[model samples]
Target: EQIGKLRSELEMVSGNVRVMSEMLTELVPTQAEPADLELLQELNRTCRAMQQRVLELIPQIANEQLTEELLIVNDNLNNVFLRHERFERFRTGQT
Candidate 1:
């Protein structure tokens, strides 16, 4: 039950990350600034690191599956940052 509880809590964080990513996409470039993007990306990576610590606490067979879910969240966050950064570069005509 303890493991399950932690897993569920982490899942909630993952859900929030997805929501943040969606909103960031909607407000990028026009509504948000470069510094905002940098801040969000930094927070995104911090979140993944936190998840890693939580994963460390869960010692069991299901750890592998839980880690995979965390990986997906990290990847999605990464993709959001990459897309926005590219969009910024294109807007600024930067190489």
Candidate 2:
């Protein structure tokens, strides 16, 4: 039950990361961050790595460890999806 929930949550995070990675890789571009070859490959690697984790569950981790992993993965995915908002955060975090 709890394991199922964790697996699904992680899968959702991985899926979110996958989509944003594509958007980051080939679509959105600005003068400072233009799309390029190695950018595509980097996204490819990251997406595959997350997907691989989603497919395999060692099923031996402690509950606290699961929570930590979820938090870490959530932050990573959030960064990819919210990178365009970093400027906003800098401003938002300011005041």
Candidate 3:
């Protein structure tokens, strides 16, 4: 039940990421400046990191068997993607 709830939210986020990626490929390039490519690439990498993390957990979401591990990784992924500054503290052992 808990995995289902978390999975739903992750799926929603992943879906939005997919939509944005499509826009970047299909439209954003035309309106963007050359320098925009660098930032967009970084953002694309970050978003894909978030997407892959969610995806890796799907088949591994085996009831309570992997609940704790899944959550810790999800927390780390969300921190990096959504709260990168906060994750820096952890990286520096300040969190």
Candidate 4:
């Protein structure tokens, strides 16, 4: 019962993150200057690191049999940051 409730909360958080990402994408101007891109790249890197922490938390979550929810949230968060990294790389020509 507790696990089910936690999973529901996780789902809501993940949905919020998705919505924020979409808003950020739209707000990031196409004509952004070099500094803007650099700032975004740094922000993207930070998000990736946070995602890594979330991934590390997954084993604990799995031990609790929240594996399905853990995997789904981790995958979605990972993909979000990875896609942002790709966009930043494309914009800055940075690896």
Candidate 5:
């Protein structure tokens, strides 16, 4: 059915985003540049938004397992988000 095809596509997109999110982690250094942080922050929000959209879509398809997987992906994104957050705090003398 077309729904199955659609679901597969969403899964693929999610997988790609997961890889990208992981790579960003690898690319960031312990003390990253301000410009780099800004760029990554933008990409981070973009990736997170796209993943959120996919999360909303999966629920409509009624794929509970995929929904769970999406949450896992979102969690990974949050970790990235937290890393940036901590960096900001550190730069601001909150550490």
Candidate 6:
């Protein structure tokens, strides 16, 4: 059915975002210099923009079953934000 196909696509998108987050987390700490931090921060900002686009697509996905996938993506986005926050705190010693 169409719903099943949409759910599958949603899963794919969610999986991609999860993988990207993992990779970013792994790379961020290795960035030891100020310039590296600046670059990483820019990259994180771009990632968040892409995340917003994914969120915008959720309601248009056309499958009620994909709602869970939308939730998962939102949760992943939150995790990404938390990770970025932690990095900022670590770098600046402030919240």
TM-score of each model, in listed order:
0.53, 0.45, 0.40, 0.56, 0.61, 0.58
TM-score between model 1 and native: 0.53
Q: Which stretches of candidate 4 lie over 4 Å from their true place?
A: 20-53, 62-65
Q: Write the per-residue lDDT of candidate 4 for residues 1-95, one digit (tens) a residue.
A: 86787677667757755764774576454444677556556655655665665576677665555666677777776766676656656555675
Between candidates 4 and 6, which one is better according to lDDT? Answer: 6
The number of the candidate with the highest TM-score is: 5
Off by over 4 Å in 5: 1-30
Select the stronger candidate by TM-score from 4 and 5: 5
lDDT of 3 by residue, 45-77 (tens): 666676576567757677664456456445544
Clashes of 1: 0
Q: Quote the positional error of residue 78 for candidate 4 in Å.
A: 0.8
lDDT of 2 by residue, 1-95 (tens): 87768767787766767666665555434332434424544654665566456435434556676756665675675566356344334433541
lDDT accuracy of residue 36 in candidate 6: 57
RMSD, every candidate, angstroms = 3.9, 9.8, 10.8, 4.1, 3.4, 3.8
Q: Write candidate 6's Cα lDDT for 24-57 as tens digits.
A: 5675543445775676567567657756766876
In the range 30-82, model 5's lDDT, one tens digit per residue, is 56677776876776677667667766765675667666655666666677667
TM-score of 3: 0.40
Assess candidate 4 and give its lDDT.
0.63
Residue 50 CA error for candidate 2 (Å)?
16
Model 1 Cα lDDT, one tens digit per residue, 1-90: 865666686687777677656756776454467777667667666665755665565454366766666566656656655765665665
After aligning candidate 3 to the native by TM-score, how far in Å is the CA of 43 from where it should be?
2.1
Which lDDT value does model 1 have at 80?
A: 57
**Which residue pairs come into collision in candidate 6?**
none
